[PDB]
Amino acid sequence: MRECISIHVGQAGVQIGNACWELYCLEHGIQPDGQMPDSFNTFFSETGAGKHVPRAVFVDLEPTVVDEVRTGTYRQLFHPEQLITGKEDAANNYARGHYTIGKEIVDLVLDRIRKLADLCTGLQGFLIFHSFGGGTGSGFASLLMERLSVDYGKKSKLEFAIYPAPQVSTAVVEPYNSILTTHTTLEHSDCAFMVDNEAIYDICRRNLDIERPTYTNLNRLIGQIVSSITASLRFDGALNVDLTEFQTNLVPYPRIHFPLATYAPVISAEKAYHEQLSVAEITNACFEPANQMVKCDPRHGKYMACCMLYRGDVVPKDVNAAIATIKTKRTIQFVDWCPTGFKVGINYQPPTVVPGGDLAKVQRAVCMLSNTTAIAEAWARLDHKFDLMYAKRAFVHWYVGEGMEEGEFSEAREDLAALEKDYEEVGVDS
Amino acid sequence: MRECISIHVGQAGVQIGNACWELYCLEHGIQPDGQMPDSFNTFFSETGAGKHVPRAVFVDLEPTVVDEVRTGTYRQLFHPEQLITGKEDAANNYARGHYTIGKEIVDLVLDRIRKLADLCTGLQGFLIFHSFGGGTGSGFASLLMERLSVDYGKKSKLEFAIYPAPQVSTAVVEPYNSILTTHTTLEHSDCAFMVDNEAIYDICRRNLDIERPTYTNLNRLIGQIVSSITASLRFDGALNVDLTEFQTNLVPYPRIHFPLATYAPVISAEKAYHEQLSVAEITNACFEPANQMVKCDPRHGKYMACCMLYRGDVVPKDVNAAIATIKTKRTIQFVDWCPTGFKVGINYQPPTVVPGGDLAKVQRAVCMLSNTTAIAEAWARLDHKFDLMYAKRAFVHWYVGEGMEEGEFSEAREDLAALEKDYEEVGV
Amino acid sequence: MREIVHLQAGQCGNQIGAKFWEVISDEHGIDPTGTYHGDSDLQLERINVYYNEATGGKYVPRAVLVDLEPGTMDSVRSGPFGQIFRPDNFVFGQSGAGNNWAKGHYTEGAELVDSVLDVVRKEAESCDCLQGFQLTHSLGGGTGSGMGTLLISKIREEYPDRIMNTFSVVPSPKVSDTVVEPYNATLSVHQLVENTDETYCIDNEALYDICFRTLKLTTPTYGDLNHLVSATMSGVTTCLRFPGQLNADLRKLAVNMVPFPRLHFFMPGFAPLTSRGSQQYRALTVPELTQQMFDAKNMMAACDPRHGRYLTVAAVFRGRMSMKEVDEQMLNVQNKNSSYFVEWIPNNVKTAVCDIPPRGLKMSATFIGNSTAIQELFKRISEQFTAMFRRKAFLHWYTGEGMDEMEFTEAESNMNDLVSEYQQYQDATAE
Amino acid sequence: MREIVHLQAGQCGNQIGAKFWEVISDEHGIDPTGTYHGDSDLQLERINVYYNEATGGKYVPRAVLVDLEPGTMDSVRSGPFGQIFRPDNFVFGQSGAGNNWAKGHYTEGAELVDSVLDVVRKEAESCDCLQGFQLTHSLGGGTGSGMGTLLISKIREEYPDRIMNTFSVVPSPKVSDTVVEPYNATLSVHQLVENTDETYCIDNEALYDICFRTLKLTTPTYGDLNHLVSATMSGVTTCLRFPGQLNADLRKLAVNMVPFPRLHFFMPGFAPLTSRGSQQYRALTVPELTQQMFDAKNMMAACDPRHGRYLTVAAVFRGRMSMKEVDEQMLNVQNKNSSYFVEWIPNNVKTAVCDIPPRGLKMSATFIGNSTAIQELFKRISEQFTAMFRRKAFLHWYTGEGMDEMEFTEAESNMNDLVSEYQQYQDA
Amino acid sequence: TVSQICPPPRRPLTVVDIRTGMENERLGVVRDSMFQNPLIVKAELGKPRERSCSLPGINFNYGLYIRGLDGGVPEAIGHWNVFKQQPTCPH
Ligand SMILES: Nc1nc2c(ncn2[C@@H]2O[C@H](COP(=O)(O)OP(=O)(O)OP(=O)(O)O)[C@@H](O)[C@H]2O)c(=O)[nH]1
Ligand SMILES: Nc1nc2c(ncn2[C@@H]2O[C@H](COP(=O)(O)OP(=O)(O)OP(=O)(O)O)[C@@H](O)[C@H]2O)c(=O)[nH]1
Ligand SMILES: Nc1nc2c(ncn2[C@@H]2O[C@H](COP(=O)(O)OP(=O)(O)O)[C@@H](O)[C@H]2O)c(=O)[nH]1
Ligand SMILES: Nc1nc2c(ncn2[C@@H]2O[C@H](COP(=O)(O)OP(=O)(O)O)[C@@H](O)[C@H]2O)c(=O)[nH]1
Ligand SMILES: [Mg+2]
Ligand SMILES: [Mg+2]
């Protein structure tokens, strides 16, 4: 049946996977050992002893990020060999993780992917978590999925990844990795969920009242969205939507696979005590520019495709009531060649909440996946800051010292100039 | 169903809304938590666990005024995001609230009403309180009516405001704010109810025997007046009157939309014990110049239109008789082109009385909305006061320093001058 | 057979229709569930004029309750006979006219006339042979005085042959609750004169005078005035509903009543108005009935018939009597008040008798008069309207609806011509 | 005798057919175990039409369920009448089409058509004299709008004489949940025009409107929409399974409303649809049914016969009545609305009556109408299809399946031809 | 709000709850109203600000819930309401 395997790359993917596989196990009721005191058959597989093992591979070139998971509360839940570590990391260098350090453990990771794929009968797709910033999350993530394309030509590979924020930044040589990572996500990727950390900070400070949030709070929200897309896979629904159908109704041309995610209602129970939360209300929250997960203005770019993922105590009629208003809104724009740009998804069970978490439980919820042309301006922002560092050849000697030919720095930039000009073509209306 | 949305502007709007929404809560039966232990549907909106959030926005530019309400008794009743605050105020500068400080929070107010307008099915009118003295209550109140007019082209907006008193004043630079605010209340409003505190000062002392009243004692009177306007909409009556109905029979020309309110009986418990009340007596007091809450004598002018909102145990037979007596009086005059100048309204539910308040429980009441030409002379003292300020250029550098060009001061005065001559065209 | 469908326009006409359905439900013995608990076969021999049959022996009024404000329908349902009405029959808008005639006629009325028309066509096509429609409304509002005239014109074009009556309430100048009331009356009377088979003018001030003096009620609510008006329509249609020694109906009255198509405005009269002094018995005869009838105190109009010439008079009697003394009294008043009647029309009185008495009583009689007195009302309305209109006062509300200024001019021209030919018909001379 | 196979395709088709077999089992008195607990003898005389006989007085449905995604099979299995079916008749794939028309028609459909045809062939040869087949599918999917067209083409050459019936679901312009929906429809309708005796255009949006307006349902689910469809298609065979005042079947109708082979597109209707509040009033009578026969808010279609001419009309009646008024309400409705009926065909209406009323109800009927208004739906789709195809948007998915470019051009040409002659028959 | 949910509705914090080491822990004289009042409440590390007013039971708050007593279309369309008249008591 439907199965998805986790190929979480990087420290960010390991931390998110810690948050995700927590939210996964309490969603079904899996004890920390891994015993139920077949909806799990998308994410867990049985053994001879009646134990459910996650379909995940946590891979890093530094041991400590995985070592704490080995000493975490879920040490015995996981299969130890799926926790793959490395002696030395790329140290925020794209060239180190791609040509020098990545190739040492390519065979071990791919063989693990083969064994987990051999466990499944019908594989729907792969979900991959990494970042554009870290060397492990950028260079090594690029090579494995270049090889995964030729190993599995038809199998789907979604790409949820972390975007360098427009203002705040953790590292300095991040944009060199980002410019050198974005080529792989073009010719070898089916959909991209590039999000920046800075967007989570604002919604956590406004909606959830958290004036002092940390990555546990950011990662819970990410896991909920991933819980939302796979909810129709895990459970029944009036309109159950798998990965393939919503894959088709976002991608007009093979080059454009960059939708924007949005979740609602994300509201602290202090606000939710006296607040009416209805279906017509929450979809308006999905359309909020301040609630967008990517730091761009929705009004700058018109919409080509939208995905609606309702979940909980919802009915089609108020969904029909909700959508009919959204079309009668002037300043919200749509492309001329898409008169109908929605994909309605309805599920039964409301989302679960973790103890010690942030989100107030709501009987209903909605996830929004919007492909708009406003996102391309964020790449342009990346293109400027890469220009004023490459002109005087800053930090180039590190990548060259690894064995990388400096012309690829030029070609990767021309990829985005051609990529952004294609987003402009969609914006032109005949 | 009917709906009225509250956009209280300034410190005056916050404290008035404190008096109003308290009286509103007791009028329906709303506990301070906000739960009934659909007449309420015109002012409250149902929520999840059975609460009724008041359909109001509380906005200001100095944080502390709203902060007391957030720590008040009705703190859980209201919506914290409905309570809109600001870091810095205008400090009685019209230009600051119009061009410098207001523009930071222009968008925030328009997002709160976006929440409210989604809740409403059919909204009947827009209720706004402010004052003509304070900077935030004048300049910021001016720009929202500019944006509301283009957002809500067809909608009704009423203008409850505090007109600065003729003799006493809590500010010096207030007439500059007052003169520059007339352009908005002339072109971006449908009905305007300028009331000065000084006349309410006399009425509270003269009739209610309270020698030392506070700001809350004036505000309860204001909330009672607004309660009288909407009482037709909230509950059934023999002649239920909508906002659109009395707006029609009040405004002879689009420029003339400044009626004068009048509430009666306003009497203490000791005084009302010896005074039996009937329809004939309560209306007679409403045309007493001593009971007008605007410092002008309608006997010096001529009425063109009068809306008439009864409330309580009233019978139309006594209504027709009372109008018959008033029409037969040389002291009460009317314009030559309005043979019938009345808009009769009857309600069943009597006005309620707030605990710890001032008004005694009376089985019947009377509300009057008189549009006369006598309100014009109240402006005539403002231009005189404004002229002797502006001729020698007093306090101008404060407004110009904000970025406002000095030519608008002459234009706004010329605007207010044109309103006075238009009042004379009615007088002929 | 002979069926009447009732349009219920405005708040005034809404309550009017409510009380009318109550009183004739009492007349036909209908419980508020909608079944029958009465005793006589003449009580249900001819009900189906006003009622429609439903399964389980249920009967529903043939009414359409139309309003621009859904507040009144809640009170209608909260009323006693509230559940007797068909749920689909009520037609209401969401925004009212605000007592603005242009808003009611053009701005918001175009949005509701379609549903009003299709409901009314359903009701008309349900019955086999329709006689005519009855519309209840006032001339001082925004909905009944507004879009009601649009309904009138539309159903005039649709059914020309079926008769049309309007139980119209006309505003009074002495007591008025609306300032734009002359404007509404001016723009409604022009529609009424062009498209109406017959009009009954009801004056609320006259009803108040009647309840003050003839009935001496301490506390007149609107229920009493509405009960009087409902008794008036009941007396109009009782000859149709029940057999009499001399039968008649609405067409019988109208054809004999209307001398020229321009003139169709009539003053009604209702005879047994008894106060507590006269609450002793009904031991009375056609003399006493006629003396109570012909006094202008007992009239419910706004115009003294002695100031004009009675063009035509009609009287319908409810109960069983002998026609001899009835004819003697009519000839008596005709010979007595020679100047008050027109000379060119001998025998100015039409008479009818319905044997069935009204319920709760055993004698009643109604009267429909066309006299020259009604010209006093149009001229007075014109005097108010001219003063309103000369200085363009209260005109921006109408002009913002998108209408031109010539419409008021042609309306007042129509009324001036109407009162001019009315004065000519008063001062007809020679032979 | 007269047997029908209930071929079932797609999630829309699988759910709609699942609610059918619940409904018609109740009409014949069949438990979810499968036995016969019915009382009347006439309840079990013609059950061999839809049901194959099984041991112990059991009646397995003559239905075969097709879907690329095996997830929906678990849902219908877990339903109320889930174990009633024969799991030898579920034929399902492992990978879905993902709402891609080209994937179903060529890529993945070729591997599963053989097993479906084997089960259909087994059911076709099981009964001696088939009346035909029956398909329920949606035009906005990948399975029902995909291989369902392929199954039609294979069956038509296999069984040409046999009547096939399809109650297809047409996507709505106002409410759409698929972006590539105009692409799937325009390529599927071309399979419909070539090989189809009879088609019905059922629109989910009009299901929404009836639930909003007629039934006044606060929360209608998808089961309510299918239950209405469960009433509609059951009425077209009630004259078949049951004797009537005037007997009829699929062939007696299907000959009557097909003037030319190209036009088989109709708007179904259902008589006694009211909300609970309306039930207290009204009278049980056939004129009310006739008012519901041609009722405005009755029919399923997303189009309005004000804008076209009724070519043919059919009305099959359920229950015991008298014949007369049925033919008179027939006759008058032709006379007054004369322009809305075509002039070249006298007696545009056809009727049938079945004696047995539906379960729990005394009176019912079904409406079958051919009007020019169905052309409103087609030119809507071309407006959506041409805009998407002008920029070659969403083309690589279909192009990746190995299909050409000219298939789009010929499909739209056939519809442009189809609406041209359809418009021509309006103006004749 | 007390009746909402069998576990007690979420409440303003208390000085027993302030325990030792949280950021809203300071010396001097301590009253519950100081930590209750939002103006002088001290925010925590990665936690939502505590409620100044008592908030309902955590199990169910719900934006809006209604199941509808329409009756269901199978029941409505099968059992079309045949008119039923009440057998009134003897008078
Ligand atoms: N939102 C979020 N982002 C994280 C988290 N941890 C790391 N990141 C992001 O990851 C980027 C750097 O990569 P890391 O995940 O730290 O490490 P890596 O992916 O293994 O790559 P290397 O550092 O070369 O080993 C930073 O810019 C962060 O934005 C996390 O817990 N939450
Ligand atoms: N009647 C009445 N008037 C008030 C009240 N509070 C303030 N005002 C009026 O408001 C004027 C000053 O403005 P405020 O309301 O205090 O504050 P504001 O409207 O925000 O204007 P700024 O102070 O400039 O920010 C004074 O001249 C008062 O006349 C009140 O409670 N009752
Ligand atoms: N005689 C009588 N007149 C009434 C009654 N109720 C209201 N009216 C009159 O109706 C007028 C107001 O009607 P309105 O509500 O504006 O009608 P609408 O605008 O058409 O809905 C007033 O002038 C009243 O005199 C009643 O019960 N009896
Ligand atoms: N009326 C109705 N429509 C349905 C039902 N189930 C699904 N649909 C519609 O079918 C469309 C999706 O069909 P899909 O599952 O892709 O069909 P498939 O590809 O043939 O399996 C949606 O637009 C739904 O509106 C149902 O039970 N009733
Ligand atoms: Mg790292
Ligand atoms: Mg202030």
mmCIF file of N, CA and C and ligand atoms in Angstrom, chain D residues 10-12 15-16 67 99 138 141-144 177 181 204 207 222 226, ligand 4:
data_model
loop_
_atom_site.group_PDB
_atom_site.id
_atom_site.type_symbol
_atom_site.label_atom_id
_atom_site.label_comp_id
_atom_site.label_asym_id
_atom_site.label_seq_id
_atom_site.Cartn_x
_atom_site.Cartn_y
_atom_site.Cartn_z
ATOM 1 N N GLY D 10 -13.983 4.569 -10.862
ATOM 2 C CA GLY D 10 -13.531 5.769 -10.193
ATOM 3 C C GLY D 10 -14.117 5.930 -8.800
ATOM 4 N N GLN D 11 -13.466 6.794 -8.014
ATOM 5 C CA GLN D 11 -13.921 7.049 -6.648
ATOM 6 C C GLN D 11 -15.312 7.671 -6.637
ATOM 7 N N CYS D 12 -15.575 8.598 -7.560
ATOM 8 C CA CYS D 12 -16.920 9.144 -7.702
ATOM 9 C C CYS D 12 -17.914 8.055 -8.077
ATOM 10 N N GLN D 15 -18.350 5.337 -5.066
ATOM 11 C CA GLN D 15 -19.198 5.795 -3.973
ATOM 12 C C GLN D 15 -20.654 5.909 -4.407
ATOM 13 N N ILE D 16 -20.901 6.457 -5.600
ATOM 14 C CA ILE D 16 -22.271 6.628 -6.077
ATOM 15 C C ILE D 16 -22.950 5.275 -6.251
ATOM 16 N N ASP D 67 -11.168 0.752 -10.178
ATOM 17 C CA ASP D 67 -10.465 1.945 -9.730
ATOM 18 C C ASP D 67 -8.975 1.650 -9.706
ATOM 19 N N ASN D 99 -5.302 12.144 -11.559
ATOM 20 C CA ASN D 99 -6.164 13.040 -12.330
ATOM 21 C C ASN D 99 -5.604 13.351 -13.715
ATOM 22 N N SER D 138 -17.214 10.096 -13.188
ATOM 23 C CA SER D 138 -17.070 11.544 -13.232
ATOM 24 C C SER D 138 -16.111 11.922 -14.350
ATOM 25 N N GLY D 141 -11.986 13.135 -13.255
ATOM 26 C CA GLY D 141 -11.052 12.236 -12.624
ATOM 27 C C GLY D 141 -10.038 11.657 -13.596
ATOM 28 N N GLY D 142 -9.327 10.642 -13.115
ATOM 29 C CA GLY D 142 -8.331 9.963 -13.919
ATOM 30 C C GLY D 142 -8.722 8.538 -14.246
ATOM 31 N N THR D 143 -9.538 7.929 -13.385
ATOM 32 C CA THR D 143 -10.036 6.575 -13.607
ATOM 33 C C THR D 143 -11.398 6.578 -14.294
ATOM 34 N N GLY D 144 -12.376 7.279 -13.715
ATOM 35 C CA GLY D 144 -13.696 7.338 -14.324
ATOM 36 C C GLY D 144 -13.700 8.074 -15.651
ATOM 37 N N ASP D 177 -12.455 21.435 -8.445
ATOM 38 C CA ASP D 177 -11.413 20.953 -7.546
ATOM 39 C C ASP D 177 -10.264 20.290 -8.299
ATOM 40 N N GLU D 181 -8.794 19.672 -15.014
ATOM 41 C CA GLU D 181 -10.151 19.209 -15.301
ATOM 42 C C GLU D 181 -10.645 19.537 -16.710
ATOM 43 N N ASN D 204 -22.296 18.549 -9.612
ATOM 44 C CA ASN D 204 -22.236 18.628 -8.154
ATOM 45 C C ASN D 204 -22.670 19.991 -7.637
ATOM 46 N N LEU D 207 -26.286 20.006 -7.130
ATOM 47 C CA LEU D 207 -26.525 19.242 -5.909
ATOM 48 C C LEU D 207 -26.356 20.125 -4.681
ATOM 49 N N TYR D 222 -21.532 14.273 1.248
ATOM 50 C CA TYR D 222 -21.552 13.650 -0.068
ATOM 51 C C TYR D 222 -22.530 12.486 -0.151
ATOM 52 N N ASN D 226 -25.312 11.675 -3.299
ATOM 53 C CA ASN D 226 -25.454 10.390 -3.974
ATOM 54 C C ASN D 226 -26.817 9.765 -3.712
HETATM 55 N N1 LIG F 4 -21.331 13.867 -6.934
HETATM 56 C C1 LIG F 4 -20.255 13.196 -6.456
HETATM 57 N N2 LIG F 4 -19.021 13.555 -6.890
HETATM 58 C C2 LIG F 4 -17.913 12.919 -6.444
HETATM 59 C C3 LIG F 4 -18.063 11.825 -5.478
HETATM 60 N N3 LIG F 4 -16.824 11.376 -5.208
HETATM 61 C C4 LIG F 4 -15.954 12.116 -5.942
HETATM 62 N N4 LIG F 4 -16.609 13.039 -6.671
HETATM 63 C C5 LIG F 4 -16.008 14.020 -7.604
HETATM 64 O O1 LIG F 4 -14.996 13.379 -8.381
HETATM 65 C C6 LIG F 4 -13.899 14.263 -8.595
HETATM 66 C C7 LIG F 4 -12.612 13.496 -8.344
HETATM 67 O O2 LIG F 4 -12.774 12.213 -8.936
HETATM 68 P P1 LIG F 4 -11.609 11.109 -8.898
HETATM 69 O O3 LIG F 4 -11.463 10.513 -7.519
HETATM 70 O O4 LIG F 4 -10.303 11.683 -9.393
HETATM 71 O O5 LIG F 4 -12.200 10.031 -9.927
HETATM 72 P P2 LIG F 4 -11.300 8.853 -10.542
HETATM 73 O O6 LIG F 4 -10.009 9.406 -11.094
HETATM 74 O O7 LIG F 4 -12.101 8.235 -11.655
HETATM 75 O O8 LIG F 4 -11.004 7.819 -9.482
HETATM 76 C C8 LIG F 4 -14.060 15.424 -7.629
HETATM 77 O O9 LIG F 4 -14.187 16.638 -8.371
HETATM 78 C C9 LIG F 4 -15.343 15.167 -6.868
HETATM 79 O O10 LIG F 4 -16.182 16.324 -6.915
HETATM 80 C C10 LIG F 4 -19.441 11.493 -5.055
HETATM 81 O O11 LIG F 4 -19.651 10.574 -4.242
HETATM 82 N N5 LIG F 4 -20.452 12.202 -5.572
#
